[PDB]
Structure formats: structure tokens, C-alpha cells
Design a protein around this ligand. Structure first.
Ligand SMILES: Nc1cc(-c2ccc(Oc3ccc(Cl)cc3)cc2)[nH]n1
Ligand SMILES: [Zn+2]
Length: 606
């Protein structure tokens, strides 16, 4: 049923537990060790099984202290190579065996980026971080690389004693390596069953600062103190999340601020969220990303999508919870602001993808499609639009939040499909079934382009952005002298960002407008990467050669694909910077994140 995994489906067998013993070698850029997988059979007379692997080196497979026959199949592009294992016994239904696999990752592992000391803040020690979603755990160790199987796990990672190792699990102790005095072993334990894509590792000279009863903030010493401040409200947001979705079951909620090449804004790794360092805007304005990763602790990590065709169930509900968290902290008016802004983003994605593009469908068919290529904000906003529309259609946020909490408890620790979600919706809202039948489910779930109906959005906080953006778009020459910094006197960082987004859509603007806009607003001096990103896009799309070097620096000084990809594609579309953009990519391609370096290459057609 999962077209992205080459392993035995959950209907044949399930991995119950993973015991990982491994060592990080920065000299060769490999993890070597063993992966003991406790696997339970789901059928009678099970005599062999298949795992997922991608660029792994297998030494042997030991079962009950004896080596066993295994075979690796031909590689299937991004899916990797399937690994068959011959069992030393035939397992009847629900019986279990432990399989010990001696493996070693490839330096080209698509799940990891190896950073040289100069690629870090401290410039003295190397760095390693993982990114498994969607199907990259197979590039770290053999497993059923599919969200349809959930497993607990325990790990022991040997690392140079000067470094620290962290995982998506509770820290369970550290000691000097008994077989190597120059190394330390960090132990971890994750008692809540998870999909293997939530497995994460990080190794580096990490410092910590406690910002809450169950929250530490991790980063290099240069950024720890800044990050502890930027995210001071995490505990504040955890209690709101708990009130909406129920108890937080993962014990610890730590935060990890990675080096600038991290490919995404955040990764909802259990116990240790990964976030881009580009959130350090200095005013906490971009902290809603933390509210997002927090919400994933219920929608996504507790209730998980069965395949990646149903990824929208994860981010769709997560965005919904996030904007309710922000609404409880800043008012319902603010919640509608983000919802409306998100609907504007959904317009941008569709315009860029195309109204008929298959990647604008809510439920996709990733058969023979690299899930990384399908990743976009469409499942985020299109998913949220559906839930918001249902919230309004079903009687308000109070009623619908009651459904969300029940939905989470109903499928806790399980993996569901869109039909599972829809089926329980009709069960929960059995009194209003006739209202649900008014919904165009076929169009919402499987038709591409923008949804069939637009929700009702409060225009209060957005009106200020619309007035100013309209003045610039419709302004002629004689109107440019009157623009002044006072236009932003009562605008927040978010409103400033929305204004740019509103202006960005109607780009390009006359060259004089862009030059005047820099004179009066000085967007070049704003550190907020969301705002800077859009201001730069507005400049390059308007053919302003002065913004070329500023955009190349931001596209390469950080690796968040949200910014790096559009900036490059825009530089490649500008005639005056096409050559410089391509040449720049070729140079940095070798030291970019593997997933990021592959995608920009496709964007650039190199
Ligand atoms: N409009 C849409 C888009 C999708 C979609 C489904 C699966 C995907 O795989 C992933 C998920 C997360 C990451 Cl980090 C990388 C790849 C991406 C996107 N579903 N519906
Ligand atoms: Zn997310």
C-alpha cells in the first residue's frame, strides 16, 4: 500500500523495536555499527522479510548468534535497494525475532550532511545532523522505511569525547568509551512508538540552556543564549497545545538550532525539535514555527499518516493547531490574519505549480515520485483551508476543536489514511451528517488547484497591508515623493511581511518604485529572513541589478530551502544574474545539503 517503501508491508511483519549501536567517524564521514530490529510476524509461515536500504554497506546479518543469508537487490533510484533476509526459522503470526544487522553508511548518505569545522559557528569542530523525512532513514540503517510501522528504540552513539550526541529520544546517560579513551558514548531511549522518519541524530560542540521545566535549548555556544531568548515562550505554548490536543506524552521537549544549511524551518523530531537558525529574528516574530513543531507532537507524531500520499493529515492539522495556539496568545484577530496570509500563500503555490499540477491535489499519488520533489506548502495551506472551512461549516472553533482532540485520542500511536480521518469525521459529527454531505469531498481531496470554496476571513489586521501595497502597485511617478517611513509607523513585523507578499504577487514593479522603496523603508537593513527574503525577491523580479549580490549571499549563507530555492530560481530567471547564479551553485553544490543540492539542480536544470 506504501509505494515509497521497498520493504515488507505491515501486513507481513512490523518492526517493534530498534536497538542501535553505532559510532560516528568524521574522518570518513560514516556511521558504523549494528541495528538490532525486533520484528513481529503478521502471517503464518513467515520465512523471510525485506528491509529498506539506501547506499548502506552490509557486513553481515546475525540472528540468534548465527550469521544468516541476506541479499541486496538492484537500486531503484531515490527508493534505494531492497534487502531480503532469510530467517533461521519459520515464524507464525505475532511471533518475534531479533535481527542484528552490521552496517555502515555512505558519505553520500542523503539523510546526513557532514560539516567541516569552518562550516560551523565555532570553526573548530566538525558537525553532523540528520534529516530523515520523508524516506531517508533507509540511508542511515536498514528498516521498514514507511510511516505505517511505529517502533520504540534505544541507541548508543560513540563520538569524540569533545562533542555531544543528541537524538529524538530521552537522554539516558553518557560514559567514556571503554574501547577508545578519546570518545564518549551517549545513550538514548524513546519509549513512545514512532515512525522511523522521526529518528534523528546530531553530533557537535553543543551547549544547552533550560527555558522550561521540560525544555532545553541546544546550539553552538555562539547561538545558545540568543536561541533561549528567541524561544522563551515554548513552555507557554506547550500548555496551550496540551489544552487543545491533550497530554504531551513524550516527556521532554528540547529544541535544537542547527547550522545555517538546515534544509527546513523545523523538523518535528520527538523530544528534540530541529529548527533553522534563520528564525533568530531577535523579536520572536518568527516563533510561530516553534508552535508548529510543537503541535506535531500530537498531529503527526502521535497520529501519523499511513503513507506519504496522506502527508496532508500531518501538516494540515498541525497548521490548524499552530494558528489556534497563536490565536490564544494574540487574539482571534491574529489567527484570521495568519489564516488569510496562508490562503495567499496557497494562491502563490498554485500559480507557481499550475492550476492542474498533480502536486496541488490534497491527496497525492507518489508512485514513482521522489517525495522530496513533491514537498511544498500546498498540503500545509490546502489542508488548513479544508479544516478551517469545516470549522466554519460545523459551528465554530469550539465545536471543531472538540473533534480535533477526540480525533487525536482515537488514533493515538496509530497510522491512518484520509479515509480513516473522513470516516471518523462523519462518526464524530453524526448529528450534522447532512452538512458534511454539502462538502465537495472529491474536489477538496483529489482535485488539483485552489479549493472549490474560500473560507470567511477577518480583514482587520490585513487591511493596513492592503492599503499600503495598493498604493505602491497603483502609484505613478508623482506619487513616489510622498511615500515615507511613517507608512510603517503602525505596522508589525508580520504586517510588514504580508505587505511585501502582497506587493510581490504583482511584481515586477517599475525600477523607480523599487529604488524609492529602498530609500524610504530601508528593507535592506531588516534582519527578519521572512521579510528580507520577499524584499529581495521583489528586487530581482523587478530587474534591479543592485540586489544581485545581496540575494546570492542570502541564498548561500543559509540553506533553508524555503529561501534558497526561490532566490536561485529568481536569480536564474534574471538575465543579468543567470550566469552568476548557475556558476555560484556549481561551486557550493559540493558543500550543500544533499537534498537541497539535488533540488536546486533540478530547479536550475543543471
Ligand atoms: N499537495 C501535497 C503535497 C504532498 C506531499 C506528500 C509527501 C511529501 O513527502 C515529503 C514530506 C516531507 C518532507 Cl521534509 C519531504 C518529503 C511531500 C509532499 N501531499 N499533498
Ligand atoms: Zn510541519
Amino acid at each position: 500500500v506504501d509505494t515509497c517503501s521497498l520493504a515488507s508491508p505491515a501486513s507481513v511483519c512490523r518492526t517493534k523495536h530498534l536497538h542501535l549501536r553505532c559510532s560516528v567517524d568524521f574522518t570518513r564521514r560514516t556511521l558504523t555499527g549494528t541495528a538490532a530490529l525486533t520484528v513481529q510476524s503478521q502471517e503464518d509461515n513467515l520465512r523471510s522479510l525485506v528491509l529498506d536500504t539506501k547506499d548502506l554497506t552490509i557486513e553481515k546479518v546475525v540472528i540468534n548468534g548465527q550469521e544468516v543469508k541476506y541479499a541486496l537487490g538492484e537500486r531503484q533510484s531515490y527508493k534505494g535497494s531492497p534487502m531480503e533476509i532469510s530467517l533461521p526459522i519459520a515464524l507464525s503470526k505475532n511471533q518475534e525475532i531479533v535481527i542484528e544487522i552490521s552496517f555502515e553508511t555512505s558519505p553520500k548518505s542523503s539523510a546526513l550532511q557532514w560539516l567541516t569545522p569552518e562550516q560551523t559557528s565555532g570553526k573548530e569542530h566538525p558537525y553532523l545532523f540528520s534529516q530523515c523525512q520523508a524516506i531517508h532513514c533507509r540511508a542511515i540503517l536498514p528498516c521498514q522505511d514507511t510511516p505505517s510501522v511505529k517502533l520504540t528504540y534505544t541507541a548508543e552513539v560513540s563520538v569524540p569525547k569533545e562533542l555531544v550526541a543528541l537524538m529524538s529520544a530521552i537522554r539516558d546517560g553518557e560514559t567514556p568509551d571503554p574501547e577508545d579513551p578519546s570518545r564518549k558514548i551517549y545513550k538514548f531511549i524513546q519509549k513512545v512508538p514512532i515512525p522511523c522518519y522521526l529518528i534523528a541524530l546530531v553530533v557537535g560542540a553543543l551547549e544547552s540552556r533550560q527555558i522550561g521545566p521540560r525544555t532545553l535549548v541546544w546550539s553552538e555556544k555562539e547561538q545558545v543564549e540568543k536561541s533561549a531568548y528567541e524561544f522563551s515562550e515554548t513552555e507557554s505554548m506547550l500548555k496551550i497545545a496540551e489544552d487543545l490536543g491533550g497530554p504531551y506524552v513524550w516527556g521532554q521537549y528540547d529544541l535544537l538550532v542547527l547550522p545555517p544549511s538546515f534544509p527546513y524551518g523545523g523538523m518535528e523530531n520527538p523530544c528534540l525539535t530541529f529548527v533553522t537558525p534563520t528564525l533568530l529574528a531577535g523579536d520572536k516574530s518568527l516563533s510561530n514555527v516553534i508552535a508548529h513543531e510543537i503541535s506535531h507532537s500530537w498531529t503527526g507524531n502521535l497520529v501519523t499518516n499511513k503513507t506519504w500520499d496522506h502527508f496532508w493529515l500531518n501538516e494540515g492539522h498541525t497548521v490548524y493547531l499552530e494558528r489556534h495556539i497563536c490565536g490564544r496568545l494574540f487574539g482571534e484577530k491574529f489567527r484570521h490574519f495568519n489564516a488569510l496570509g496562508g490562503w495567499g500563500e496557497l494562491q502563490n503555490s498554485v500559480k507557481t505549480f499550475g492550476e492542474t499540477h498533480p502536486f496541488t491535489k490534497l491527496v497525492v499519488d507518489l508512485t514513482d515520485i521522489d517525495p522530496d520533489v513533491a514537498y511544498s506548502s500546498v498540503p500545509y495551506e490546502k489542508g488548513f483551508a479544508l479544516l478551517f472551512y469545516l470549522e466554519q461549516l460545523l459551528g465554530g472553533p469550539e465545536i471543531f476543536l472538540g473533534f480535533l482532540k477526540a480525533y487525536v485520542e482515537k488514533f493515538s500511536y496509530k497510522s491512518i489514511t484520509t479515509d480513516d480521518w473522513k470516516d471518523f469525521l462523519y462518526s464524530y459529527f453524526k448529528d450534522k451528517v447532512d452538512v458534511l454531505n454539502q462538502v465537495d469531498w472529491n474536489a477538496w481531496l483529489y482535485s488539483p488547484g485552489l479549493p472549490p470554496i474560500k473560507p470567511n476571513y477577518d480583514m482587520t489586521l490585513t487591511n493596513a497591508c492592503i492599503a499600503l501595497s495598493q498604493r505602491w502597485i497603483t502609484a505613478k511617478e508623482d506619487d513616489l515623493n510622498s511615500f515615507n517611513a511613517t507608512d510603517l509607523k503602525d505596522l508589525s513585523s508580520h504586517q510588514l511581511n504580508e505587505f511585501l507578499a502582497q506587493t510581490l504577487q504583482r511584481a515586477p514593479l517599475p525600477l523607480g518604485h523599487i529604488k524609492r522603496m529602498q530609500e524610504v523603508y530601508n528593507f535592506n537593513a531588516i534582519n527578519n529572513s521572512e521579510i528580507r527574503f520577499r524584499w529581495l525577491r521583489l528586487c530581482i523580479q523587478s530587474k534591479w541589478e543592485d540586489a544581485i549580490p545581496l540575494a546570492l549571499k542570502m541564498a548561500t549563507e543559509q540553506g533553508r530551502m524555503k529561501f534558497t530555492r526561490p532566490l536561485f530560481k529568481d536569480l536564474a530567471a534574471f538575465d543579468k544574474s543567470h550566469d552568476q547564479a548557475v556558476r555560484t551553485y556549481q561551486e557550493h553544490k559540493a558543500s550543500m545539503h544533499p537534498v537541497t543540492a539535488m533540488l536546486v539542480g533540478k530547479d536550475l536544470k543543471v
